[PDB]
Amino acid sequence: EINPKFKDLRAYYTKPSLEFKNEIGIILKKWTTIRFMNVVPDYFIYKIALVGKDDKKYGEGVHRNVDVFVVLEENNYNLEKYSVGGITKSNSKKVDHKAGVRITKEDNKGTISHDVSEFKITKEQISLKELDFKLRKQLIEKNNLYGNVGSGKIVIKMKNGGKYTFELHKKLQENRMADVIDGTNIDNIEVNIK
Ligand SMILES: CC(=O)N[C@@H]1[C@@H](O[C@@H]2O[C@@H](C)[C@@H](O)[C@@H](O)[C@@H]2O)[C@H](O[C@@H]2O[C@H](CO)[C@H](O)[C@H](O[C@]3(C(=O)O)C[C@H](O)[C@@H](NC(C)=O)[C@H]([C@H](O)[C@H](O)CO)O3)[C@H]2O)[C@@H](CO)O[C@@H]1O
Ligand SMILES: O=S(=O)(O)CCN1CCN(CCS(=O)(=O)O)CC1
Ligand SMILES: [Cl-]
Ligand SMILES: [Cl-]
């Protein structure tokens, strides 16, 4: 029912997450190996690692109209509240979009399940981090991802034919946690677990 071969992935993708909307980001002078966006939604300062394309995108100073999708992590910088990527532009208008999910699953025994789902997007711009994190956590919850089976792929398919693939046998590559896409152009989501 739960295989220890996948324990790290199942623990990573069942971690709680936090969403910060219509917020402000402060980036200061580089002090270590990378640069951080500081966000202060409550009594804490959160350090959001500027990885991948976020490094060039954000100069030092103040950035308004910022959403962040947060998954707090251990780290080697001695930081209490740290997460990687998931910074996006705050909605410029109402967003309430759902995309169809089709899920196919094959265990080691040959049993082939077929689920469907609907995925609610409430952001005009959304990080792959958020999509990857929320879709995996769901698959674990409802389809036993990282229980009996722990590989395969998620494919996000777009109105224009483009796509974004998450391979299920490892974490999303950290650089990709900074990648962002138009939520309301997500057409459907194809999950294949094998
Ligand atoms: C070492 C490392 O972390 N390197 C990553 C790249 O990932 C490695 O190379 C891959 C080819 C694969 O072996 C993977 O296991 C390695 O970790 C990474 O390259 C992306 O990897 C993912 C799979 O993890 C996809 O294969 C992706 O291709 C696509 C996609 O399907 O998602 C193709 C697609 O056409 C394209 N979409 C559009 C609209 O242009 C997307 C899109 O560029 C990305 O999804 C954006 O995140 O890519 C491989 O590109 C690479 C991607 O940025 O980053 C590190 O270099
Ligand atoms: O489980 S998680 O690690 O994801 C949640 C961590 N978390 C988010 C909300 N706060 C501060 C609230 S406040 O006191 O500053 O208002 C601490 C508890
Ligand atoms: Cl961790
Ligand atoms: Cl797009």
Whole-angstrom distance, CA of residue 139 vs CA of residue 126? 19
Please state, in angstroms and as integers, the Cα–Cα distance from residue 177 to each residue in 68, 115, 132, 188, 193, following that order: 11, 27, 9, 20, 22
Evaluate whether 103 touches 60 at the Cβ level (below 8 Å).
Answer: no
Do 108 and 158 sit in the same domain of this protein? yes
| CB of 43 shorter than 6 A to ligand 2 | yes
Do 65 and 25 sit in the same domain of this protein? yes
Residue 184's domain spans which residues?
Answer: 1-14+91-194
Do 35 and 10 sit in the same domain of this protein? no
Which of 12, 15, 44, 79, when mutated, tests ligand 2's pocket best, judged by the most ligand atoms within 8 Å of its CB?
44
Among candidate residues 171, 167, 170, the one with its CA nearest the CA of residue 192: 167
Do 64 and 108 sit in the same domain of this protein? no
Resolution in A: 2.5
CATH number of the domain to which 33 belongs? 2.40.50.110
DSSP character for 128? H
Do 65 and 144 sit in the same domain of this protein? no
Evaluate whether 99 touches 131 at the Cβ level (below 8 Å).
Answer: no
Do 85 and 158 sit in the same domain of this protein? no
Closest C-alpha to ligand 2, atom 14? 43
Residues 6 or more apart whose Cβ sits within 8 Å of residue 24: 39, 40, 62, 63, 64, 66
Where does a domain end: 27, 57, 90?
Answer: 90
Q: How many CB atoms lie within 10 A of CB 159?
A: 11
Evaluate whether 135 touches 189 at the Cβ level (below 8 Å).
Answer: yes
Which of 13, 18, 75, when mutated, tests ligand 2's pocket best, judged by the most ligand atoms within 8 Å of its CB?
18
- What region does 140 belong to: left with phi over 0, alpha with psi -120 to 50, or beta? alpha
Radius of gyration of the chain (CA): 17
Do 109 and 177 sit in the same domain of this protein? yes
Structure-token pair, residue 73: 């992590």
Ligand nearest to the CA of 13: 3
| Structure-derived torsion over alpha carbons of residues 141, 164, 127, 133, reported in degrees to the nearest 10 | 20
What's the CA angle centered on 16, arms 11 and 104, to 5 degrees?
A: 60
Do 38 and 48 sit in the same domain of this protein? yes
Whole-angstrom distance, CA of residue 98 vs CA of residue 128? 16
Do 114 and 162 sit in the same domain of this protein? yes
Do 57 and 82 sit in the same domain of this protein? yes
Where does a domain end: 69, 90, 111?
Answer: 90
Do 96 and 170 sit in the same domain of this protein? yes
| CB of 132 shorter than 6 A to ligand 1 | no
Where does a domain end: 74, 90, 106?
Answer: 90
Query: How remote is the CA of residue 101 from the centroid of ligand 2, in Å?
Result: 31
Number of compact structural domains in the chain: 2
**Residue located via tokens 């936090």:** 18
Query: At 140, which helix (H) or strand (E)?
Result: helix 128-143
Query: How remote is the CA of residue 72 from the centroid of ligand 1, in Å?
Result: 24
Query: How remote is the CA of residue 187 from the centroid of ligand 4, in Å?
Result: 10
Do 60 and 117 sit in the same domain of this protein? no
DSSP character for 183? G
Give phi and psi for 62, each to the nearest 5.
Answer: -110, 130
Ligand nearest to the CA of 41: 2
Structure-token pair, residue 93: 């208008």
| CB of 170 shorter than 6 A to ligand 1 | no
Method: X-ray
